[PDB]
Ligand binder design. Structure first.
Ligand SMILES: O=C[C@H](O)[C@@H](O)[C@H](O)CO
Ligand SMILES: O=C[C@H](O)[C@@H](O)[C@H](O)CO
Ligand SMILES: O=C[C@H](O)[C@@H](O)[C@H](O)CO
Ligand SMILES: O=C[C@H](O)[C@@H](O)[C@H](O)CO
Ligand SMILES: [Mn+2]
Ligand SMILES: [Mn+2]
Ligand SMILES: [Mn+2]
Ligand SMILES: [Mn+2]
Ligand SMILES: [Mn+2]
Ligand SMILES: [Mn+2]
Ligand SMILES: [Mn+2]
Ligand SMILES: [Mn+2]
Lengths: 385, 385, 385, 385
């Protein structure tokens, strides 16, 4: 189960770089130089890295220091063959963003947030990113009077429309992906799930420029089925990018390595990605626990990729098994894929077999045989065929 | 706090009519005749009632019994002046719907579900309903292999498109409202939240015919902020109807009377409905607890309406208070309502005050004054000004 | 992975017997005769069955019908060699129990609940049960004024003390196991978790007669770690019995077959049971989903046992692996098992190496190596060593 | 609603002192000197303050700096008349505690944790505290193999037994209160709820020295009913102290001011505290949101106390209302307080009215009248009688 760059595995700088500060504790690890993380990840088989602005260039850096941090980074990517498929902006750490970036009540902050974003879009394009992520972790509220949500969605629409005007005016080939999260660090965050983000995109001026970057642990923080939300983003043609990690249920955002957390949801997610032929980056947005030293950081990053390749093998064995293909027909998955009424409305209304002479008792008595199918899926996951 | 028919309070037949069967217990109350519930609700001040097909006409009724049940019902509405603003279909109780109605894997069941629905659309129009609700409580799965969600959304799109062809062909003035629920009775339900339902509507052939009917307890079953999801449905122009009740957090769907459950979320919901000028029915979809006799049923239905009118009074006193209007300006709610960059993109890019000379420390130091605003909201809710 | 009676697998009559009535739907399967379930379970390799009173003898049966239902049941156990290690009382289905059994506000109901219980204790002893379970699913409240909890715990203590007087007076060899559940069907249930049940037992007159019967899905309905609650019940010497099933997070009680739900928690539960040498019944309290016919019922019951034996094999391979034993020492699990201060208090106070000369920076820098250990556990679960 | 020192309102130094660092952001406020917080809180009407060791004396302070920080603090308490009823130890911030204090796998760390604790017990006694709190926020695990929970409870028992030997040997009049929390910052924390903490205390060598300090938001992080857990701690005689705050459901620990979050649970908590006559400190363990400046800090601290006094007034009006006392009898709360079988076991067994001639249908038909009672409670909370 050895990853190579063709598996398209990517990592944020801030993931292996997390120093382990939590709401209740100090850092347990020293800061890593981005150049060192590029080298170590390339040795483990990753394909590329991603960054917020402030991960790469320390906030407040002069133009001269900026160019230096970029030059060194670009040297490490040249040295290793690592790519940068995605970049994003930090609009959450600095105190100025305490009430949001794009939906801060202070108009001056909102203008600042857009300027900080556009500066990083130019950088991202220079480094070759194809996707620019937006996670508005400070957009929201702890109390009901602090944020009129209609006005806040007007502000959020306005910011995304201005960014889409900017990229089209520059002729850049970059698309945006909004990443939803239901809470933390705000009491409630706006666009809290993949569905809310999909719906909001349909009101932007140029919807084709925007998709979603859903994260496993975020949807599970609302108790939702992650594979079902990804199937809906795929159905809408909007899965531009994905963030992979693990989460044990509804609590703070744990960001465990991928495969930890809900392991059957991990299996059905890989099953769907590989069967729909998603071809974007498999990006890990995770935190090695603060119990770990540097050795434990690289072990946790390597288990992200390992677990994805094991689940890929298991899901492909499941769908290839003749006995599973038989059970899928026994449960009528083939019939779910056929149109209900390709005959059209009038024909359905005239069909006595659809109502007047439909035997509801006989149809009610047929079992779905779902539990036999699900135990075959369990046996395949566990290697117990 | 006495309701009249002008407050537009409505109730489902199945709400005061719930006999108190739960997953662990037998009915504790006898069945009510719909005619008796119409009379009792009209005496309490309601404006109207709503129904599933099978609440009004017992499943399998002959054409003759059907006409009789409708005639008696119509007599009670004539006698009381009660209206029927909304109707819906039962596609969840009968065993035939064990795997869904519109997304059952069996194609024959899917055709049956559409025929059962269309028959009830004609009835609804005859009784004057303006909104037809769809709650697909059996659309979903307990296991990952039982439902390919992309094929299931194709089926769900197909069913809603056929219904929109039917109403337009008949020239009916009726719109559809999809009601999301994240789980129960299926392990996960498709379109589990208001955002997922809004996004799905944008892929239908005639999106203007469809909106949402969100329910308080359903969004809170995913830990989401109900007033924020309603603000997004209002922002999209899709709040066609609403279901009011109470829920204590993330657990089974309790359907407590409105005002029970999360009382501050109830306050901020009424604040939003009345300030956005929602003019649809205020419909209660609740269950008087099975501890109650008939007296306790009508007391619980009356407290639904009582609590709405108390919260309405408190939220109007809050927004009318000069000291609250001052605190709203102190927290920059006025600035949230102004465009971030009506000056346009180029102007924002040339503005040195938005970046190069923006004093981030001074802006970071300004407090939002949100806690004083929220305590004024608390004092107004409690009548403790 | 074939079960035999020596694996001590047991099933409630109500589990394979569930007809599939849910809060939103009618039964999808016909009722099974207890004699048929005894035979089918014995063919699948189970060791025994359990029962509520009302599963075996229909509520209100005359003394003559009672003796007949028992005689037939006893014939099937003789025919198959099946045992009955546990029995319990239904104090939740009948409308009389709408506010509880032992903590109903009506004193007459509370006396009735005790009489119904004692009648079934005599039956249980006659059939050889060693454990009598109490699940007070109706003990609790939907609203704060309906139940004074101090008075309710006095009532609950009083009922359990009377039952312990009864068994000791009869000289029966039977112990009680209280089964906690946090909600459903009441809004909140008293003694909602294993910890609350352990604490309550310590106030009974004869605590040695009472332990816990925790259920996987119940603790996970509160978001708690099931293996950690079982380790605490084992530490207290009170794991008298256990109920095995699966649950996907915090929502209604799903009762999926064991291994479904949280599969890594299932692995660590089997690891603990087999390493602590629990020797009671491995009892399944699950519901075959209502999508299923009879074939799907027996498939789901068989996958309960299958999944337990696969996890047993995987956890034994994990603890036997020399490389895992090395990683356990690398993470200092051996040091967790040694006393912190067997030297005693004075010695600890005089030890300069514990404070004055303790190098906190060096100890802080040591990694715990937990992620390497957890990936070995993942590889062993998946058969990917 | 003006607090005075006789209301016994207390605050941690770390609460108004929180600088607003969160997992995603930098501090938004400067550090406060403890002397300034003592003065400001005394002006708002508080009765006293509490502290962790490291809040008062910066970690690593020499003996000389230690004595200086204590002298200044003692001057401010003398100047204001503020008391210090409770103190606790920080065993969670420093990197050395990354795997726990009392249950760290490294034995050296466990000995260090006890020495750090005992040094602060002596300080606490010197300042007059009567309760010493233990919150083991780092005791737990992110993965199943990292912590054998039986060995960890042996270690936790050992540490608490050594502390109880120390206080008894010194002749101090100080009792311990364990504060449970279900997760955060560890993936799962040991003794995660009030019930688990009550049960654990019953295995200590001298149980009478130990009680609980439950926190509103902590039990609600497991979806549990806080007033019901406090009624059980009161029933056991173990409510030594309490921490008051607000939380919106199951998510990260928000620590909103008291009255925010679940306001009806706040009402029923004050109802219980004042009706059981709890006479300990009403301590607020909350964080003014990081959106706030210093003005917003003192406003949030003042609303904690305000909300408690409003709820106290409302709950006393509820229990004093003759119409409520009538409804309580209508719902048989008086009967819940009477023994079920003061007549004894034999008498219950011979009583034909408890079984053979008990009319279950008539008892089943009586309504509990709970919804009328709960609407009276709602009207009293809202001031809408
Ligand atoms: O902005 C950060 C990211 O893009 C987001 O993915 C974090 O890593 C949150 O999840
Ligand atoms: O179909 C039923 C309804 O329309 C739904 O609202 C139920 O009452 C569920 O919430
Ligand atoms: O009383 C029923 C049982 O003993 C209980 O285990 C149910 O099956 C609930 O879980
Ligand atoms: O140790 C801290 C406390 O005693 C704890 O109460 C925190 O403030 C956590 O809740
Ligand atoms: Mn995350
Ligand atoms: Mn992410
Ligand atoms: Mn509902
Ligand atoms: Mn509804
Ligand atoms: Mn259960
Ligand atoms: Mn059970
Ligand atoms: Mn807290
Ligand atoms: Mn606390």
């Amino acid at each position: 189960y050895q990853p190579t760059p063709e598996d398209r595995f990517t990592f944020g700088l801030w993931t292996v770089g997390w120093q382990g500060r939590d709401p209740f504790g100090d850092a347990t690890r020293r800061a890593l130089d981005p150049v060192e993380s590029v080298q170590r990840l390339a040795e483990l088989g990753a394909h590329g890295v991603t960054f917020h602005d402030d991960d790469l260039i320390p906030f407040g850096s002069s133009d001269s220091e900026r160019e230096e941090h970029v030059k060194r980074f670009r040297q490490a990517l040249d040295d290793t063959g690592m790519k940068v498929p995605m970049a994003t902006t930090n609009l959450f750490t600095h105190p100025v963003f305490k009430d949001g970036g794009f939906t801060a009540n202070d108009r001056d902050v909102r203008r600042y947030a857009l300027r900080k974003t556009i500066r990083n879009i130019d950088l991202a394009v220079e480094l070759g990113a194809e996707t620019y992520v937006a996670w508005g972790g400070r957009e929201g509220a702890e109390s009901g009077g602090a944020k009129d949500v209609r006005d806040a969605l007007d502000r959020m629409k306005e910011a995304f429309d201005l960014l889409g005007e900017y990229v089209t005016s520059q002729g850049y080939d970059i698309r945006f992906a909004i990443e939803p999260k239901p809470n933390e660090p705000r009491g409630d965050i706006l666009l809290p799930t993949v569905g809310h983000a999909l719906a909001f995109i349909e009101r932007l001026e140029r919807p084709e420029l925007y998709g979603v970057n859903p994260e496993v642990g975020h949807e599970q923080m609302a108790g939702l089925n992650f594979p079902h939300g990804i199937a809906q983003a795929l159905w809408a043609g909007k899965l531009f990018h994905i963030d992979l990690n693990g989460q044990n249920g509804i609590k703070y955002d744990q960001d465990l390595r991928f495969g930890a957390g809900d392991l059957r949801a991990a299996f059905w997610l890989v099953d769907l990605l590989e069967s729909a032929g998603y071809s974007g980056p498999r990006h890990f947005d995770f935190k090695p626990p603060r119990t770990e030293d540097f050795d434990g950081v690289w072990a946790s990053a390597a288990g992200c990729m390992r677990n994805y390749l094991i689940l890929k093998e298991r899901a492909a064995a499941f769908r290839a098994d003749p006995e599973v293909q038989e059970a899928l027909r026994a449960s009528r998955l083939d019939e779910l894929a056929r149109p209900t009424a390709a005959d059209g409305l009038q024909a359905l209304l005239d069909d006595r077999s659809a109502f007047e002479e439909f035997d509801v008792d006989a149809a009610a008595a047929r079992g779905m045989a779902f539990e036999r199918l699900d135990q075959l899926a369990m046996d395949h996951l566990l290697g117990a065929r």
